[PDB]
Design a protein around this motif. Structure first.
Motif, mmCIF file in Angstrom:
data_model
loop_
_atom_site.group_PDB
_atom_site.id
_atom_site.type_symbol
_atom_site.label_atom_id
_atom_site.label_comp_id
_atom_site.label_asym_id
_atom_site.label_seq_id
_atom_site.Cartn_x
_atom_site.Cartn_y
_atom_site.Cartn_z
ATOM 1 N N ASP A 69 0.843 -1.190 0.000
ATOM 2 C CA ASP A 69 0.000 0.000 0.000
ATOM 3 C C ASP A 69 0.882 1.245 0.000
ATOM 4 O OD1 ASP A 69 -2.195 -1.813 0.578
ATOM 5 O OD2 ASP A 69 -3.191 -0.204 1.703
ATOM 6 N N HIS A 119 0.890 5.542 0.648
ATOM 7 C CA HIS A 119 0.195 6.613 1.324
ATOM 8 C C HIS A 119 0.821 7.885 0.793
ATOM 9 C CE1 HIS A 119 0.087 3.015 3.997
ATOM 10 N NE2 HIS A 119 -1.190 3.324 4.056
ATOM 11 N N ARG A 167 -4.358 12.663 2.416
ATOM 12 C CA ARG A 167 -3.525 11.483 2.293
ATOM 13 C C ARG A 167 -4.321 10.448 1.504
ATOM 14 N NH1 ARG A 167 -2.418 8.041 7.420
ATOM 15 N NH2 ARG A 167 -4.273 7.128 6.414
ATOM 16 N N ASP A 189 -4.677 6.814 0.185
ATOM 17 C CA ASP A 189 -4.243 5.484 0.551
ATOM 18 C C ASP A 189 -4.550 4.555 -0.621
ATOM 19 O OD1 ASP A 189 -3.528 6.489 3.106
ATOM 20 O OD2 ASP A 189 -5.649 6.459 3.675
ATOM 21 N N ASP A 236 -9.173 9.649 4.348
ATOM 22 C CA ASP A 236 -9.937 10.210 5.448
ATOM 23 C C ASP A 236 -10.255 11.682 5.214
ATOM 24 O OD1 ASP A 236 -10.068 7.869 6.843
ATOM 25 O OD2 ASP A 236 -8.430 8.371 8.223
ATOM 26 N N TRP A 248 4.743 7.323 2.685
ATOM 27 C CA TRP A 248 5.162 6.098 3.349
ATOM 28 C C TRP A 248 4.474 4.911 2.728
ATOM 29 C CZ3 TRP A 248 1.418 3.641 6.814
ATOM 30 C CH2 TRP A 248 0.290 4.413 7.131
ATOM 31 N N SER A 254 3.143 0.547 3.357
ATOM 32 C CA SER A 254 2.753 -0.416 4.371
ATOM 33 C C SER A 254 2.328 -1.711 3.682
ATOM 34 C CB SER A 254 1.623 0.152 5.252
ATOM 35 O OG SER A 254 0.445 0.375 4.502
ATOM 36 N N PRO A 255 2.167 -2.778 4.456
ATOM 37 C CA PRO A 255 1.797 -4.085 3.895
ATOM 38 C C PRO A 255 0.483 -4.067 3.110
ATOM 39 C CG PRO A 255 2.563 -4.344 6.141
ATOM 40 C CD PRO A 255 2.506 -2.864 5.887
ATOM 41 N N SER A 273 -2.559 -8.060 6.070
ATOM 42 C CA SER A 273 -2.208 -7.896 7.486
ATOM 43 C C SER A 273 -0.731 -8.161 7.821
ATOM 44 C CB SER A 273 -3.104 -8.778 8.360
ATOM 45 O OG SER A 273 -2.876 -8.533 9.737
#
Ligand SMILES: CC(=O)N[C@@H]1[C@@H](O)[C@H](O[C@@H]2O[C@H](CO)[C@H](O)[C@H](O)[C@H]2O[C@@H]2O[C@@H](C)[C@@H](O)[C@@H](O)[C@@H]2O)[C@@H](CO)O[C@H]1O
Ligand SMILES: CC(=O)N[C@@H]1[C@@H](O)[C@H](O[C@@H]2O[C@H](CO)[C@H](O)[C@H](O)[C@H]2O[C@@H]2O[C@@H](C)[C@@H](O)[C@@H](O)[C@@H]2O)[C@@H](CO)O[C@H]1O
Lengths: 280, 289
Positions: free
Chosen positions: B101, B103, B120, B122, B141, B154, B156-157, B160
């Motif tokens: 992912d 951001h 932001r 995502d 958001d 940034w 991220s996975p 999970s």
């Protein structure tokens, strides 16, 4: 011989914010004096103020959290020694800053970003090596980040990005419009300003070009042409001064804001300080 | 031919907006990479999605769209002009950090901004992720509208417990779809290893590139004729002027060394300057570093 980067204007970075240049302009008051601390470099390659070499050092801050504020370091984490501030430190004056940082040595979880909200009031003492912030997050340790946006210092104030901070400080000196009828050329970028674009006086890649080349200054000013790279037509005459800024003579009612942004500056010849430019 | 007369630690990463803090070789020196940013031939031909400036690296611009299933961006080049799908995998500068992912922090261009101006976005690299066809989807958001321009903040996975591997690249197409990828970079043999320039960057659960960004702009700017099969470089300490090691710069635009056993360029100081020495044969035999 002196050269300038063979890169079109639209592929050059702003030297005061992390953004690309999207137009040139002249100041409304063509006698306006500026004193930017980033984007400053002599033609011989002497960096001035807080100017760093890379576009990815422009308007970024690093330091260790104390809790709250940052005890500033250089962007590589090495000690800042009390230059006006660490190299690359933002120079957008008289406004609040909102700086997005992450913890450098951290196994990160959740949301890794903190936004540091910084006021340019009394504890703003970057020359002495510290600034204060408030944040809705909880940053700790070694934080590195980038100026994300700016806003008014007080309610109803306007942000003027032509101003610089009060760092205390060994400032790069003011730039005065030189000669007769000349206007300093400002390279403009979009940037998020709450309550206008951000100007600079040299594209960042010009700064690194001069640092790398260390070319000797052989005259009072360098005449540049701004060239269409496809038709090879000269679209305008500009003067590059040894102190590291560019001027033009704007046609009345106009100026370099009317030129296409895909042109390339090319060194033409050394000229006399008062060489009179063709209006552009 | 020259290469930038700038110390390594003053050079930018070409895949994320960050400075280079070290060099390394891959743990498996036979690993093949296919990065789409930081790619440029020695003659100055940009490849993949590689842009010219460090301030174009890992940025996205597009116009927000909304459908019943959510929002997305209809992509443009970073200057707002039409995206060249006919010749590139995505707009120039588009991030190439695969299988995670993203951001991305954006603002509305040409908007009188008030309050908090940032959104932001995502972004997941799942089925509607088809940047080559000119669109991506996001959740946010905030409430971004119109022409949004921004920078990868940034990663991220994707799921999970998954792990972000920044050595991977995206799948830019939706299907068989031709995406015009820069080709793979193969370790060229005889014990040579590709040199990777590494940067810190916020990854939830370092980021490598194969050319510092200022090398790319240097090659574009000079349009230098390639006069041999490889360029021999020395990595020189700028304070003592001593040669710290030999490196080879190949025409396709990547750098190798022969790493010392148990070591390699990760053990060199990070403030050296690469200097062109000579044009050499593709099989010029390097001293280990
Ligand atoms: C209409 C109204 O009352 N708006 C207020 C905002 O202007 C306030 O924002 C803050 O404005 C001051 C200037 O007076 C200064 O620029 C602050 O940096 C700024 O706060 C930033 O922006 C806010 C919206 C928040 O995101 C905050 O975290 C930022 O630091 C806000 C906050 O005081 O109140 C509104 O009512
Ligand atoms: C399980 C745990 O320890 N933390 C969870 C976070 O990892 C989750 O964040 C989301 O993680 C998924 C991976 O399955 C993916 O990486 C999402 O992009 C990521 O969401 C981001 O990070 C979140 C923490 C939020 O800040 C979100 O706004 C970001 O976009 C969150 C999801 O709510 O759950 C935690 O328990």
């Amino acid at each position: 011989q002196l050269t300038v980067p063979n890169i079109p204007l639209n592929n050059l970075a702003n030297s005061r914010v992390p953004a690309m240049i999207n137009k040139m302009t002249v100041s409304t008051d063509q006698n306006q004096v500026v004193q930017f601390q980033n984007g400053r470099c002599t033609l011989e390659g002497q960096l001035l103020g807080t100017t760093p070499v890379s576009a990815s050092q422009v308007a970024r801050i690093r330091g260790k959290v104390f809790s709250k504020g940052l005890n500033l370091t250089e962007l590589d984490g090495t000690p800042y020694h009390a230059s006006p501030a660490p190299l690359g430190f933002p120079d957008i004056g008289a406004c609040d800053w909102h700086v997005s940082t992450f913890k450098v040595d951290q196994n990160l979880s959740g949301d890794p970003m903190s936004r540091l909200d910084v006021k340019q009031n009394a504890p703003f003492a970057p020359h002495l090596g510290s600034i204060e912030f408030t944040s809705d997050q909880d940053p700790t340790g070694d934080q590195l980040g980038t100026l994300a946006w700016v806003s008014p210092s007080t309610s109803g104030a306007r942000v003027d990005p032509w101003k610089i901070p009060s760092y205390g400080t060994h400032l790069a000196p003011p730039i005065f419009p030189p000669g007769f009828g000349e206007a300093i050329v400002y390279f403009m970028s979009d940037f998020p300003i709450v309550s206008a674009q951000v100007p600079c006086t040299l594209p960042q890649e010009f700064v690194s070009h001069f640092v790398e080349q260390q070319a000797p200054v052989r005259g009072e000013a360098a005449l540049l042409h701004y060239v269409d790279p496809d038709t090879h037509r000269n679209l305008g005459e500009f003067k590059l001064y040894p102190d590291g800024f560019i001027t033009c003579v704007p046609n009345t009612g106009g100026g370099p804001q009317n030129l296409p942004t895909n042109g390339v500056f090319v060194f033409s010849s050394w000229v006399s300080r008062y060489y009179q430019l063709k209006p552009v």
